[PDB]
């Protein structure tokens, strides 16, 4: 009975991880803007996207869009955060305008305390990414779950 719950928990984690795979493996080489009060390839800071702790935001290249149909792949902005101890995906469907747009916030994984991301430059894992011209060779997304603790997943970035 509790075992059904723990089996479901592992399924929940996989739904989250596969969603993260579809973003972090398909990182687009395009600079996005944070329209508050600048402009980067990978955005990474405290309270970004109104996260309770760390927040990440970057451009994503989508190919199998069910709604729209561009063969070459639509570029859209995506992001991750923690809110009320849930890992949440944030998605921007349309381009950036001074009007602003309705973001799509989707909770992926429950009972997640902390989000942490480390970047591999080529020889060493670092805590920030100031380079706005080129992506890091690899990205390690670490999720701190209340039950399982720290789980990390590494992603190789395509170069350009």
């Amino acid at each position: 009975e509790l075992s059904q719950e723990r089996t479901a928990r592992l399924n929940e984690l996989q739904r989250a991880l596969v969603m993260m795979d579809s973003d972090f493996r398909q990182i687009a080489l395009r600079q996005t803007r944070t329209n508050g009060e600048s402009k980067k390839l990978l955005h990474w800071a405290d309270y970004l996207l109104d996260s309770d702790n760390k927040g990440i935001m970057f451009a994503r290249l989508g190919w199998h869009n069910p709604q729209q149909q561009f063969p070459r792949g639509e570029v859209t902005k995506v992001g991750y955060r923690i809110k009320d101890e849930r890992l949440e995906r944030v998605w921007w469907r349309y381009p950036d305008t001074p009007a602003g747009q309705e973001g799509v916030v989707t909770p992926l994984l429950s009972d997640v305390e902390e989000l942490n991301v480390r970047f591999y430059d080529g020889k060493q894992w670092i805590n920030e990414w100031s380079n706005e011209l080129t992506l890091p060779a690899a990205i390690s997304v670490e999720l701190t779950l209340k039950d399982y603790g720290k789980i990390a997943r590494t992603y190789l970035t395509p170069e350009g």
Partner: nanobody
């Protein structure tokens, strides 16, 4: 419903009005909140926003004229509108704020009118 607005209606140009937003069903105090409007003949446009710590932000065409505030005790977001111009006539929505000018979980809204 999580966000319900109140205090709309008609006012003479140059008049004042205070929109209210009843928050419920989530940890209001820990969220950044915003106001968004839709004027006739235009899409939805971000008006103002208030951070969890209290810091505020405004669009140029409303700065120093509209004032956003929040009451964490009663879970209510306010928008004090002063010197109301005809151009402000729009459907004002209350929403959660992502930073920048982007919003989500938009409320049903209230009609504010003037000409």
């Amino acid at each position: 419903v999580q966000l319900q607005e109140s205090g709309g209606g008609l006012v003479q140009p140059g008049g004042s009005l205070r929109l209210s937003c009843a928050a419920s069903g989530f940890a209001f105090s820990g969220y950044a909140m915003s106001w968004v409007r839709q004027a006739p003949g235009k899409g939805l446009e971000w008006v103002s926003g208030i951070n969890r710590d209290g810091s505020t932000s405004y669009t140029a065409p409303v700065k120093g004229r509209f004032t956003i505030s929040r009451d964490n005790a009663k879970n209510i977001l306010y928008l004090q509108m002063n010197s109301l111009r005809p151009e402000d006539t729009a459907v004002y929505y209350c929403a959660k704020w992502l930073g920048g000018r982007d919003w989500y979980d938009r409320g049903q809204g209230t009609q504010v009118t003037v000409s």
